[PDB]
Write a protein that binds this DNA or RNA. Structure first.
Ligand SMILES: [Mg+2]
Ligand SMILES: [Mg+2]
Lengths: 419, 469, 469, 419
DNA sequence: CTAATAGATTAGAGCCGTCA
RNA sequence: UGACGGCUCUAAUCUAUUAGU
DNA sequence: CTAATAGATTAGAGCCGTCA
RNA sequence: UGACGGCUCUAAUCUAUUAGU
């Protein structure tokens, strides 16, 4: 009949039964268990008895604590005993002891004069003994091919384990820049500005270049710090439109494309720093970058838009801070970083690297994807200007409008999230 | 709105020709490729360390269970998995008394004391290798915690001595290259984590729920270091050879300079995978200059091409040069002058600086593991670390950080480059993990470099990996 | 005319703590003392060599029959005796192109072609060991028979590298001492001799009734080289250390430079035997003087005694310095200078070139093996080759030569000294024979000396006997 | 009942049966075999049948080409079948297939479907299978100890192989020198002796010393070669006796005792050479020592008391040769050796070292201990003059008697030499 | 050559978490 | 060099005495 | 320091038999 | 160093402009 029945303690031993079934199937011996025939539409009980009585050659049983004194196990044993009596098969039930806690004093009275195969130390000896028993007893075999094992692994192991295509929207920390001022302006100051003026500290962004000055503001702007500026013809300046710079079009011996793009990035970073300093937000200085964080009591109930930005951890109060980085690859963006900073009482930080690192690494265990996402989006919304724009000051009228909704990606591959 | 693509998870070829995605399931269902007859294990250390090693080696014979079986596949036993014999009856011992170790850690100078301790440990190994008759496959060094905590590059008190790195591990691995001795270093804290305690009545390292994974890693290290091949790639493109580059800064070897190391992979004749380095540091005296002068670049490419020809007899059709730096026109003109006319040279640079963190709306689990945002024809992203549906967990905490793939020099399909980079993440033999977050051709090069840099000039170094890792 | 005596037979301790007299029966009855799990091998030679090696390995699977069981016991199978595996599936092959061998037979100088062939083999062996991830135990070489045919020094046509010998085997083993890779050299004719015939219709070499002994010898040698201990002495007391000094002629230099190479043996306190070589070559620029200078004598004795102390802890109470020559007062005084107080120093001299053959008056069979003729208080004659009642055959076909054992300097009983010599002939691991014609402390010293004399670029040579035989 | 019977092909399969029996006994299992005992003549099948029927728990039969179609094998199979029928035991006979070439077309009809244990792969695997089967069959056993196997090996394998005290008599080649002269003489001939006369050509032996002449001969002797001897005074000769300088009772500053002993040895050797030259015997020039051999037909029919000294091998002739030496350790002896030489026709040698060496190697294969002893003694007795001795002239009337009987040795331990 | 302003790159070290 | 055994042809060296010092 | 006359020690190489 | 991942404090090199030499 070529079919072999294996019984165990379903479902407390899925791994061992599955491994034994696959190892036996790959060696040419079929195994009947719940892993096969994954369907419940047909009767799930009468099929077992019909298979045992009609087309089963060798019957097997696995001894376990759960299988003992089980109604189903007892019924299967009774049916097997009846089949053995009908066939006059001396060796029709072969129990296998796999539990270490099953003492010899509490063994079943039915099986007391039959030797038992141990499985406590190593399963290889038991498998070899089973193979020797099958080959000696002329146990029938199927076609010898690994295709059976491969197909069973492909269609049974990953039955409820395959990815399902479904639309999902991914949020980022990339605030897309919407608008730029029309023209870039290098202003020619023929030694009118002091040789050691330190132009980086005036009211508007400014980067020195040759004998001129680079800025987005008006020709006669930020003249409070430079009294000797009015006596200057406006025609002595170079206006490079910013649309052709961010198009790979402008390249002149005066200044190249790469240097002008770097200048624009630097100016955007300075403008972002000034704007974040003008929003009344305290800052923490890191090794290379600067993060801006809220104080306790400035925000209503330490919670904006049903989400919390300042909380409490035992003797330490934590605050949520971000840093800005401007890039032009692949398109004008503004990368925003997620940071956590801690305070003793909500206004004074703790000045020690070890304690800050310890507190930061202790918090992340509780927080997850949703916490980070909602807190960052709430922070950006708090920084918002009117509804969806968050400009940066560059001059009298010139402004760079940065969106408060980060770039969103869509993906056709996602998981079911089985809670 | 922008578009993301998806690249599927590659399989790896285990024994019997079967293909399984995970290394753990492949080994626990089919087994390793080759067949070792046993592991003739030798031990070097103190008596207490030997006792704890014997107890641990007797401990992992039986099936050992994790906490959450769905997340982490189980470790059922060494013989039922790796198909070779490994017990504590064949253990060969060589004692290092506590008095010698205690007296060597008394010079108050990290360099001299480390030198003395390494010499103490290695003279016994060399003598037992030359004089004795017993055959030892892997030497298991058991270093006590009381000297481990001081063998660090930076030590503060609460003459060819400046040419060697102040680390016990790297000095140990670099002082045994001329004798070719496989070696595994263990700690007294790892083995008897329960016995070692703290001020409170708790173990320092809680392994009560990471027991199976620890056994898996230790067992696969012991299997590979003895001459085994636990798994291999399922599919490798023929006629295409890879490479990898890492730069390491020396510890004041009479001047601050930097070296370059390599480790390649390809499918040779016989449907086999060769995974073997290209040893020999190539320096340049300029400080902070991570490039190759034309002579060194020509020598490197010529050596790789000659090795491939000697193995096969046909020149490669494609040569991929993975790196973390960028190639200037000087060293690419150094290449393509020794490159054959019917050969294609591609330069791929991999870095993880750019911070694009992608979130899921109304969800608690992070992004998947096979994504890619192809920016242009010569740029992309790849989320090598992320959620895995098979094991229902994320490879990283918080939100994982993506990779960057740019074709600085050469022409090829970017999708194929991403797929090839993604496949080189499944070949970490130092640990039995589902997938790696960094291609191994740029990590085994670093492993070689950190060891070769920790010694003086040595000629004709070995190319196998078991002598370094 | 003087009465003879009988010096019994030695006992050797096999597994389970059992005893016997013949190694073959004890190994085939009880088993070896060591449990090697397996053996991995690699063959170097043309494809003919690979075919012949594979056929020979598969040949031991078929039963091997000896003509007479009592005269020459059979081979009951590898795994049935040695509790290990040596199969024709772990073979690792490094083909040697026949064109390279053929193209090297043009210099017409024996030294150059010998060096070139040794290089052509050892280069592949070294590179395979260095740059391949498989673990091997013994490397086998299958030399083409035409190479040995054309290596005859008496052949006519019908200085950095000049200090080398003109033999393939000695130089080949010589240039692998700094890599510690055990090697076995096979001549292709020995493995496949049936196909080698002459113009008579019969094979050149006949192994028909002596194939079993050949299988015994090869199996025992390949087991010993891989780290096994098939048998061990049991009647060895404590405190006794044996040394055997053998002198040579290095030549290949400005002076004849008679070098000295030794061996050492004693008890290890763990109920084991330490049979290891003791060779750091000591050179005497004088020609024909087979005595060591006082500095060399002190160095040799001090090194041996320091090794004894390191192995045990305290110095021996009795050292027997065997040699094939006599000694002089200055050398013995130099020994006495470094020797402690309670350390008896005894010199023994053993010779065979003494014409004295005993003819049996009654029968035609040879003399009994263990007989002796005690000449004097300080001399006696020992027979070691002849008729043994266990094997019921003669060790030597003709009338054998005895051994003239004499004591020269020091005092020792002349029957205990003769019983120890007969007890030291049961530990020849190179060949599987009932007995030999010399104690092994004076036999293996010759092989040690002849291996490390072809090349002089070796410092601190190995002491294990698996790299020499 | 704690016994197993092995039926084999005596004596064709003694080795395999013995190895299996010793291996099984070593683990503590009792094994009963026909070759184990030697009780023959008494009722043998009746005891075998009684043991098989009464106290035999397992029976194994080995099968070979010899064991196939054999009366004993068939009778044992019939007895085993009868025992199985009486006991109604299915597992009582287990074949041990050891003949690989015995195809199933010619195997015994009684054993054609029985489960035969395979020994073709490796005999240790077969032994392990036998042990596993015996454990499954619950063969009674005691604690593991090879003491029974060791006792059986001691009392059976080496039964008639112990130390036996039997007197033996040995021959040798040491021929003891018997007669010695009265004194040694230096014949001082101060500027009165020939200088380059080649004194090793005289009719009497001589060894020079300074300007003297060391020999036992009298001054008046050998005057034929030395004309200037008569004009000389007898007071100018240093007489030294022989017995004390043999025993070492000579301590004089004139000559050292070792040097005088060396001169004695040289005199003896020269006397032997001259006397053998007087016998008119042929001479062979080897590397260092010169051998002695007879021509073809020197004696009657080339025989001396049924001992052959000149013969013919294929198309070549051979002559037996000997050599001697005069050593004084431990007691005065004239050691004799043996060699062989070849002549093409019977009177001329072959001038080729390789041919002579190969010819000697070929001939000596068929000569045994008795052959060498007989030839050596017979050739020695050719020298002996009258009844028991032979003289070596060492003076005017002084003869040195060398014996014709080899030195005997006595031994007390021998063997039973069981043919 | 020396000393500052920045953007864009690289390599080292050291500390913490892994489950529920 | 798969071993072992038995032979054969060669070369130094030392010791003693003698003649070229 | 060289060359002969001996005895007494030493180390190299080469060749052949193993069964019946 | 049984793995891996995520952070933080630091150091170079390059490119552009300016300036004392
Ligand atoms: Mg490792
Ligand atoms: Mg050998």
């Amino acid at each position: 009949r070529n079919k072999i029945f294996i019984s165990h303690a379903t479902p407390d031993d899925n791994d061992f039964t599955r491994w034994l079934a696959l190892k036996l199937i790959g060696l040419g011996y079929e195994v009947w268990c719940d892993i096969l025939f994954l369907d419940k539409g047909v009767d799930f009980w009468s099929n077992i008895e019909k298979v045992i009585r009609e087309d089963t050659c060798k019957f097997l049983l696995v001894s376990s604590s759960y299988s003992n004194q089980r109604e189903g196990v007892l019924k299967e044993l009774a049916v097997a005993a009846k089949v053995k009596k009908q066939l006059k098969d001396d060796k029709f039930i072969i129990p296998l002891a796999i539990d270490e806690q099953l003492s010899y004093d509490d063994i079943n009275i039915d099986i007391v004069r039959l030797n038992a195969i141990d499985f406590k130390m190593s399963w290889a000896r038991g498998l070899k003994d089973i193979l020797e028993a099958f080959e000696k007893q002329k146990v029938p075999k199927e076609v010898a091919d690994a295709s059976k094992s491969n197909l069973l692994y492909q269609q049974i192991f990953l039955h409820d384990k395959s990815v399902i295509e479904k639309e999902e929207i991914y949020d980022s920390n990339w605030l897309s820049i919407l608008s730029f001022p029309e023209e870039l302006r290098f202003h020619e100051y023929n030694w009118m500005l002091p040789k050691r003026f330190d132009v980086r500290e005036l009211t508007f962004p400014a980067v020195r270049y040759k004998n001129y000055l680079c800025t987005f503001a008006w020709a006669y702007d930020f003249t409070y710090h430079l009294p000797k500026t009015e006596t200057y013809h406006k025609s002595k300046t170079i206006r490079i439109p910013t649309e052709e710079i961010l198009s790979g079009s402008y390249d002149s011996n005066f200044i190249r494309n790469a240097e002008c793009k770097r200048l624009i990035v630097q100016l955007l970073n300075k403008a972002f720093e000034l704007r974040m300093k003008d929003k009344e937000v305290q800052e923490y200085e890191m090794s290379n970058k600067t993060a801006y964080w809220l104080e306790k009591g400035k925000l209503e109930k330490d919670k904006f838009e049903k989400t919390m930005l300042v909380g409490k951890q035992k003797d330490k109060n934590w605050h949520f801070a971000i840093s800005g980085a401007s890039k032009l690859y692949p398109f004008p963006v503004l990368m925003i970083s997620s940071h956590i900073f801690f305070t003793a009482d909500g206004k004074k930080l703790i000045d020690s690297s070890s304690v800050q690192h310890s507190s930061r690494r202790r918090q992340g265990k509780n927080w997850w994807n949703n916490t980070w996402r909602t807190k960052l989006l709430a922070f950006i919304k708090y920084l918002s200007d009117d509804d969806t724009s968050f400009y940066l000051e560059m001059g009298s009228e010139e402004k760079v409008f940065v969106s408060n909704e980060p770039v969103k990606f869509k993906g056709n591959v996602s998981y079911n999230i089985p809670e | 709105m922008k578009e993301l693509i998806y690249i599927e998870e590659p399989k790896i070829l285990f024994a019997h020709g079967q293909k399984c995605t995970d290394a753990r399931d492949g080994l626990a269902l089919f087994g390793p490729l080759n067949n070792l007859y046993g592991i003739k294990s030798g031990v070097i250390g103190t008596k207490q360390g030997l006792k704890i090693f014997r107890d641990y080696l007797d401990h992992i014979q039986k099936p050992i269970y994790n906490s959450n079986s769905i997340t982490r596949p189980m470790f059922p036993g060494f013989e039922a998995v790796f198909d070779c014999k490994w017990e504590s009856t064949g253990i060969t011992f060589k004692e290092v008394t506590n008095e010698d170790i205690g007296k060597f850690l008394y010079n108050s100078s990290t360099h001299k004391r480390t030198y003395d301790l390494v010499s103490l440990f290695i003279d016994k190994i060399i003598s037992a290798n030359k004089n004795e008759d017993e055959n030892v496959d892997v030497w298991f060094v058991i270093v006590p915690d009381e000297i481990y905590k001081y063998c660090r590059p930076n030590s503060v008190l609460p003459a060819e001595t400046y040419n060697y790195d102040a680390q016990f591990h790297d000095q140990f691995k670099a002082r045994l290259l001329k004798h070719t001795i496989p070696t595994q270093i263990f700690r007294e804290s790892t083995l008897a984590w329960r016995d070692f305690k703290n001020a409170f009545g708790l173990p320092i390292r809680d392994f009560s729920k990471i027991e199976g994974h620890l056994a898996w890693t230790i067992s696969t290290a012991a299997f590979y270091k003895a001459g085994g091949k636990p798994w291999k790639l399922s599919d490798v493109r023929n006629g295409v050879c890879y490479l990898g580059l890492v730069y390491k800064k020396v510890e004041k070897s009479k001047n601050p300079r930097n070296a370059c190391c390599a480790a390649q992979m390809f499918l040779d004749n016989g449907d086999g995978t060769v995974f073997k380095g290209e040893v020999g540091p190539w320096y340049n005296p300029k400080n902070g200059q991570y490039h190759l002068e034309p002579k060194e670049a020509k020598a490197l490419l010529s050596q790789s091409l000659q090795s491939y020809k000697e193995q096969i007899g046909e020149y490669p059709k494609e040569v991929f040069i993975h790196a973390k730096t960028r190639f200037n026109h000087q060293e690419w003109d150094a290449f393509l002058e020794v490159t054959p006319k019917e050969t294609n040279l591609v330069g791929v640079t991999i870095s993880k600086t750019k911070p694009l963190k992608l979130y899921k709306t109304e969800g608690d689990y992070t992004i998947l593991r096979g994504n890619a945002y192809v920016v242009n024809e010569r740029s992309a992203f790849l989320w090598t670390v992320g959620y895995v549906p098979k094991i229902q967990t994320a490879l990283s905490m918080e939100v994982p950080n993506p990779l960057f793939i740019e074709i600085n020099k050469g022409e090829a399909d970017i999708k194929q480059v991403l797929k090839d980079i993604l496949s080189l993440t499944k070949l970490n033999y130092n640990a039995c993990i589902f997938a790696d977050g960094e291609p191994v051709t740029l990590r085994f090069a670093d492993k070689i470099g950190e060891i070769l840099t920790a010694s003086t000039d040595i000629k004709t170094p070995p190319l196998a990996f078991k002598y370094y890792i």
